[PDB]
Structure formats: C-alpha cells, structure tokens
Amino acid sequence: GEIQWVKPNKETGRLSINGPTRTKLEPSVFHDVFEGNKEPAVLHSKDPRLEVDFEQALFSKYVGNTLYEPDEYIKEAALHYANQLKQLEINTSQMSMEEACYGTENLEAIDLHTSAGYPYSALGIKKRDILDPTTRDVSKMKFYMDKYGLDLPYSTYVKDELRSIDKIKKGKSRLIEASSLNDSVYLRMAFGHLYETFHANPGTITGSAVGCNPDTFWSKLPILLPGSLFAFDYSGYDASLSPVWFRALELVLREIGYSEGAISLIEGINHTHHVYRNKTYCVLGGMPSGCSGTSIFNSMINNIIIRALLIKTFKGIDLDELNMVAYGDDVLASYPFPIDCLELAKTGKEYGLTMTPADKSPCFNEVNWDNATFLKRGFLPDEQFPFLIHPTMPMREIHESIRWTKDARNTQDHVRSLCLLAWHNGKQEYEKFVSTIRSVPVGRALAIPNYENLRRNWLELF
Numbered sequence: 001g002e003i004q005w006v007k008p009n010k011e012t013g014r015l016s017i018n019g020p021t022r023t024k025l026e027p028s029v030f031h032d033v034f035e036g037n038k039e040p041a042v043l044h045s046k047d048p049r050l051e052v053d054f055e056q057a058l059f060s061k062y063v064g065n066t067l068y069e070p071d072e073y074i075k076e077a078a079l080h081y082a083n084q085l086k087q088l089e090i091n092t093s094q095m096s097m098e099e100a101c102y103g104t105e106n107l108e109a110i111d112l113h114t115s116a117g118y119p120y121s122a123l124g125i126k127k128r129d130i131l132d133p134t135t136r137d138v139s140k141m142k143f144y145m146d147k148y149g150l151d152l153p154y155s156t157y158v159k160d161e162l163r164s165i166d167k168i169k170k171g172k173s174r175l176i177e178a179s180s181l182n183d184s185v186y187l188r189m190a191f192g193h194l195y196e197t198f199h200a201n202p203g204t205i206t207g208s209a210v211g212c213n214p215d216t217f218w219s220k221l222p223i224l225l226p227g228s229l230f231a232f233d234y235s236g237y238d239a240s241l242s243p244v245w246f247r248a249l250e251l252v253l254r255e256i257g258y259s260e261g262a263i264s265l266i267e268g269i270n271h272t273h274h275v276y277r278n279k280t281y282c283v284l285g286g287m288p289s290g291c292s293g294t295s296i297f298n299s300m301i302n303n304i305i306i307r308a309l310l311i312k313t314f315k316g317i318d319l320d321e322l323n324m325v326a327y328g329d330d331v332l333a334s335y336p337f338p339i340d341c342l343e344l345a346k347t348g349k350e351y352g353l354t355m356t357p358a359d360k361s362p363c364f365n366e367v368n369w370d371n372a373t374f375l376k377r378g379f380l381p382d383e384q385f386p387f388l389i390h391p392t393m394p395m396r397e398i399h400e401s402i403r404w405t406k407d408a409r410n411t412q413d414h415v416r417s418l419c420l421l422a423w424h425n426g427k428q429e430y431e432k433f434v435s436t437i438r439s440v441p442v443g444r445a446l447a448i449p450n451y452e453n454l455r456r457n458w459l460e461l462f
C-alpha cells in the first residue's frame, strides 16, 4: 500500500474527530507484583517518550506498491484456491439487510460497542441510535444509508494498547481504520453468506481459522496439517499488500460465482480514503486495519499469497499437497516434505512482502509442534490425553497484561480472563501464577478458578 496524497479537511470538507487522546491504561494493583516492560502505546505527537516524528512513524507502514496486475503465478494461485472453495457451495446471493445488521447462527450481529465510523462518530451518532436487537428494525439503517451514501472514508485513530519500549521510542503505534457503518452493512449484505460458511468451517478447505475456538480447534490442527510445518511472521502485512492482491481476490470471487456488483466492492477496500485527526488522505493498496470486517479477506488473500510464492519459488511443486490455515497475516501450513522458508521469504520480497521465519535467526528447525505458534499460542499435548492439544498463551504475555488495566473496577473479571488463558500451560505454571496473584492481599480476596475444574470443563468440549 502507498499513500497518494494528504490534504487538510478544510480542503476536502471531511468532518474531523476531536482530542484528547490520553491512554485509558493505568498500572493495576499487580503492576509491581508481576514483571514486564511494555507500556501504553504513543497516542499523540507530543508524547515525551517519542524519539522520532510520530505522524511519519505511523504512516511508514505503507512501504509502497510493487505490482498492480496479477502475473501468471498469482493467476494460477488464485485459480487453485478458487477451485478448492467450490466444494463449499458458497451462497453468492445478497444477504438481507436484517441479517447483515443483526446476525444469523453463523454470523454475529454488527457489534453495537464499536464506533459507527464516518460521519457518525464525528456527528455523535452511535450504532445504538440506529440499530435495536430487540426490534431487528432496518428502516432506520436504510434511512442513514440513503442519507450518507456508500463508499465513505475510513475514520482512523490510534489503538490504545500496550507496546514494547522500542515501539514507543520509535513511534510505532497501530491504527484502527473503521469503515463507515454504511459500507459494513453493504459489504456484509454482499458477502454475508461467504462469511457464514467461513465461520462454520474453520480448517483447510476454507484455508481459514477466522472465528475458531482455540480450546477445541487446536486438537484438529495436527490432523489437518500432516507432514512438515512451515510458518512466517510478516512485518506489516496489511499495509504491505499492493493492489495486485486485491485483483487476485477479485479473480477468486469471480471464479466462485460472484456478480460484478458484489466484486466491485473490493476496489473500495483497495482504494480508500482515511480521515486522521484533521487531514484526509488517499491510500492505494493495503488492507484497512483493526477489524474484523476484514479478517476473511485478509485470510483469503493469504491463501493466494502462499500458493503464489510456492509455485514461483519451486518448480513442480504440487499445490494439491498444500495444507494451510490463515487468520489475517497469521499462517500455519504443512507440506509432505520440508520447504526452504528463506527462499520463500526472498520471493516474498519481490512482491513487497516482508517475511521472517518465526524463531531466532534466520530459518527453520523444521518448525514442528513443540515450537509452532499460531494466534500467539503454542501447542501442548495433554499429559493424560495426548490427542487433546492445549493452546498455550505464553505466561510472558499474561504477565504483561495483568500489570495494567483500563478500568480499576474490573480486577475480578480481568484476573479470571487471564486464568482462563493461563491454566493451559500446565498445573505447575498455573499454580505459580495463582500463588503470585495471592502474594498480595487484594489477590487473596479474588475468586480464582480451580485448575482441575477448569480442565474438566475443557474435557467436556470433546
């Protein structure tokens, strides 16, 4: 992706969003009980921890666009993926406005907590004002759809979250780029059934893990990905995608039966306008980031990418023998025999993608189940029931999180949350964690879940 121009809102007539942008994160009662070193991300240009220009650090993610037009490899990759999806029988007919807004069994209601985007956030109009789950009324949504139209700018703001110290000095905060509610509804009307089938079918047919429940999905992965694993970390995947990947996605959507009306919506994600503070700017390439409404298309594009890199790097590679699941930039894949990840990463570089095998430096200790990572979690076979796989969030992450809170009233819920994640690391790790919570009088007053009970509830899921 690449920014084309930047203009003040005075010029473009776009509505600004306000200040103040101080963090809501504060040191919790555990900040000094547990160890970590992340702090709240930089939120504003005059933050005292900044060592660089903020605005320019924020937009440096846009590394440019390499290709605009699918070559033969990308073309072949798109076809393979699209053929594979045919077995799912995705319903390409429009989804009703009611279902797009309010949900079906395989699609969640538009979240009534997050902002409604442009112009609603700037006008003070909330989702709550438009949408009622008790009524499932769409007449008010239609009213605002007619009022503001489609294809609105992406109201863009800095994510309030913990970051490494290096990310803070270097101003590398992350942005949330919210589409207008109007455009989410219309996108969801166009591709809602596809979203339903992807949520219902996490796995290797869809090539997708979006919406999965790691508690149970982890046990399936070793079966769905036999042979030898490969996996990378992208740097700045979303923003590094050039328009070519959007063209390839269109090829996939066309191959599986989409009308040109539906398909033309992709260009509105490839070429977008953003309003950040009081400037508006045009981005070409790059998946808009921070939702959710974008996860499936990032994941689909990743299935295309991996395929294209595979056939362009290695001759006579058989794509039928590839197994992969993707969740946004995050990918876990396997092939009948080892793959030179370094050579993949150099092909990636040709397409403007930055890739690094997840490890130290540089490449692949095979990457097998003991050190594999997906959605941040490792893979730990149960001690008693090895066919059951625990998803393990590293305690280091849990340690970072507990030390901060956005609301002091939430100590109980925040701690229970972390315990639900921690016990998967084993009895001994869990007990050490609980005992540290309990080294402090507030900790002792909390309701903390019992290990073997947590485990028995987990066994019931199988």
Ligand SMILES: Nc1nc2c(ncn2[C@@H]2O[C@H](COP(=O)(O)OP(=O)(O)OP(=O)(O)O)[C@@H](O)[C@H]2O)c(=O)[nH]1
Pocket (backbone or CB within 6 Å): 159, 172, 173, 174, 175, 176, 234, 235, 236, 237, 238, 239, 289, 290, 291, 328, 329
């Ligand atoms: N901007 C943004 N990115 C998100 C968000 N949620 C998930 N992501 C993903 O996070 C990536 C940015 O992650 P960072 O922690 O800044 O860095 P990175 O891309 O992992 O690469 P490194 O710099 O090597 O650490 C994007 O490319 C997205 O795929 C979000 O809310 N906003």
Ligand code: NI
Pocket (backbone or CB within 6 Å): 004, 271, 272, 273, 282, 283
């Ligand atoms: Ni533009």
